[PDB]
Amino acid sequence: PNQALLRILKETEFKKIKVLGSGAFGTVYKGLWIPEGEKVKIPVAIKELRTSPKANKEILDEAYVMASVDNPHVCRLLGICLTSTVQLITQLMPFGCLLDYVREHKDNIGSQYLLNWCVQIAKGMNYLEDRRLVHRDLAARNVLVKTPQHVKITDFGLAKLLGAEEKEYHAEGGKVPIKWMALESILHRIYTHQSDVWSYGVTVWELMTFGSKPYDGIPASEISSILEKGERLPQPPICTIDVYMIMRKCWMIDADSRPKFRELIIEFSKMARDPQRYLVIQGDERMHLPSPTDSNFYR
Ligand SMILES: COc1ccc(-c2ccco2)cc1Nc1ncnc2[nH]nc(-c3ccco3)c12
C-alpha cells in the first residue's frame, strides 16, 4: 500500500550554504544536511515559497505530491523542516537545471544525450501518469540533471490529483505559463495527461533548440490566437522531419489524438538506438567531460 509519509527534520541539522536561484515563480536555497547521529553530510535543495495561507496550502498539496512519488526519473522529496515557514527538502542535483545546462553546453552535448533525456522525461511523465496525477507545469526549467546521463522532474507546486472517475481537472484561475499549455487549457482551464503531453512537446522543443525561448516575440496574449490559426513552434535545426512529427503530434487540436507517454517512450527509445538518424549535429564525435570541469558542482 503506497501511501505518502512526511519525515520532519530538525532545524539544527541544516546548514544553508547559500541560495540556488529565484525562479519567476519560486525561490530555492542550497543546503548540506547532517543527521544528528549519522555524522555524514548529504547535499540538499530547500524550497521556501515566501507568507500567505493560499501559498501555505499550495506547499501542503505540493509536498503531498512530492512525498508520494517514487521514480529514478522524478526527484523525490525526502523531508520537511519546520522553521518560521515550511521548508521543502529534496536531494540536491549537482548539475542543476537542464534548460540552463543545454544553454551552457550546447556545443558539447551530442544527439545521444538529447534523445536519452527525452526517453527519461517520458518515463517519469509516464510514471506520474500511472499514479493518476497531472504536472500542469512541465517545462525545461523544471527538469534537473542528476548526472549528464540522468535527468529528473521537480516543482509540483501546480500538480493536482485525479479522483476515481475523474479523468480531467478544472483550474481555479490563471497564473499558468501558457506557452507550455494546451489550447484547451488556455480556453476552458482544463488539464489532462494529454495536456502534459503538449507541455512535454514544448520541453522537447526546448531541449532540441538548446534552450531557445518558445514564442519569444509573442506577448503571451497572442499565443491563443496563433494556436487557433493552426501553426505551432517551428522545426529545430538538428531535428529531422521524424522528431518534428512527434512534437507536432503533441500539439494538435484533439487531446485524445495526442500520443500517450507510453508510445513516446517507445518512439524516443527507438530513436535512441540510432541517434545519428534523427538528429544532425556538427560534432557528435566529441563528448563533454563532467565532474572534473566543476562549472556547476558543489558539495
Ligand atoms: C525548479 O527547480 C526546483 C524546483 C523545486 C525544488 C524543490 C526542492 C524542494 C522542493 O521543491 C527544487 C528545485 N531545484 C533543484 N532541486 C534539487 N537539486 C537542484 N539542483 N539544482 C536545482 C535547481 C537549479 C535551478 C533550479 O533548481 C535543483
Residue 56 within a domain: yes
State the distance from the centre of ligand 1 to the C-alpha of 238, rounded, in angstroms: 29
Per-residue cell: 132:
493518476
Of 92, 107, 142, the one marking the end of a domain is 92
Do 256 and 179 lie in a common domain? yes
Minimal CA–CA distance to 296: which of 84, 101, 25?
A: 101
Do 79 and 136 lie in a common domain? no
Name, in order, each residue with C-beta under 8 angstroms of 104's C-beta and a sequence gap of 6 or more.
295, 296
- The partner residues of 19 in beta bridges, in order of sequence, read 29
The answer to whether 198 touches 125, Cβ cutoff 8 Å, is no
- Per the structure, the complete domain to which residue 209 belongs is given by 93-293
29 SS3 class: strand
Alpha carbons within 13 A on the beta-carbon side of 9: 22
Residue 265 within a domain: yes
Q: Mark the binding-site residues for ATP, compressed into ranges.
A: 20-28, 47, 90-91, 155
Residue 34 within a domain: yes
Core vs surface per residue 88-113: b (16+ CB within 10 A) or e: bbbbbbbbbbbbbbbebbeebbbbbb
- Whole-angstrom distance, CA of residue 104 vs CA of residue 242: 26
- Whole-angstrom distance, CA of residue 227 vs CA of residue 204: 18
For residue 137, indicate whether it is catalytic.
Answer: yes
The method of structure determination was: X-ray
Q: Is 119 exposed, middle or buried (0-12, 13-18, 19+ CB in 10 A)?
A: buried
Phi, psi of 216 (to 5 degrees): -60, -65
Amino acid code (one letter) for 187: L
For ligand 1, pick from 33, 154, 203 the residue to mutate: most ligand atoms within 8 Å of CB: 154
The 10 Å Cβ neighbour count of residue 23 is 15
Do 137 and 87 lie in a common domain? no
Of 34, 68, 92, the one marking the end of a domain is 92
Distances (CA, A) of 7 to 27, 83, 123, 153, 175: 22, 14, 27, 21, 31
Do 138 and 51 lie in a common domain? no
The answer to whether 44 touches 78, Cβ cutoff 8 Å, is yes
State the distance from the centre of ligand 1 to the C-alpha of 215, rounded, in angstroms: 25
Within 6 A (CB) of ligand 1 lie: 20-21, 23, 26, 28, 45, 47, 75, 77, 88, 90, 92-93, 96-97, 141-142, 144, 154-155
Do 41 and 108 lie in a common domain? no
The answer to whether 175 touches 185, Cβ cutoff 8 Å, is no
Per-residue cell: 295:
562549472
Residue 264 within a domain: yes
Per-residue cell: 105:
553546453
The answer to whether 49 touches 59, Cβ cutoff 8 Å, is yes
Name, in order, each residue with C-beta under 8 angstroms of 286's C-beta and a sequence gap of 6 or more.
108, 110
Closest C-alpha to ligand 1, atom 2: 142
Residue 45 within a domain: yes
Closest C-alpha to ligand 1, atom 7: 47
State the distance from the centre of ligand 1 to the C-alpha of 222, rounded, in angstroms: 30
Residue 298 within a domain: no
Q: In angstroms, how far apart are the furthest CA atoms of the chain?
A: 62
Give the active site residue among 61, 137, 196, 216: 137
Residue 211 zone, left/alpha/beta (φ > 0; ψ -120 to 50; rest): left
State the distance from the centre of ligand 1 to the C-alpha of 168, rounded, in angstroms: 27
In CATH, what number is assigned to the domain containing residue 251? 1.10.510.10
Do 192 and 259 lie in a common domain? yes
Do 74 and 98 lie in a common domain? no
Do 121 and 70 lie in a common domain? no
Alpha carbons within 13 A on the beta-carbon side of 8: 5
Name, in order, each residue with C-beta under 8 angstroms of 223's C-beta and a sequence gap of 6 or more.
178, 179, 186, 215
Of 92, 116, 138, the one marking the end of a domain is 92
Do 247 and 99 lie in a common domain? yes
Residue 107 within a domain: yes
114 SS3 class: helix
Residue 192 within a domain: yes
Q: Which run of H or of E encompasses 60?
A: helix 53-66
The 10 Å Cβ neighbour count of residue 175 is 9
Distances (CA, A) of 119 to 112, 152, 249, 284: 11, 11, 17, 19
Per DSSP, the residues of 61-107 read: HHHHHHTT--BTTB--EEEEEESSSEEEEEEPPTTEESHHHHHHSTT
Q: Mark the binding-site residues, compressed into ranges.
A: 20-28, 47, 90-91, 155
In CATH, what number is assigned to the domain containing residue 13? 3.30.200.20
Strand segments (E) across the chain? 8-9, 14-23, 26-33, 42-47, 77-82, 86-91, 96-97, 133-134, 143-147, 150-153, 160-161, 169-170, 190-191
Domain count, the chain: 2
**Long-range contacts from 288-291, C-beta under 8 angstroms, 24+ separation:** 288/105, 288/108, 288/109, 288/148, 290/95, 290/147, 290/148
Do 188 and 70 lie in a common domain? no
Do 40 and 126 lie in a common domain? no
Do 162 and 144 lie in a common domain? yes
Per-residue cell: 207:
531541449
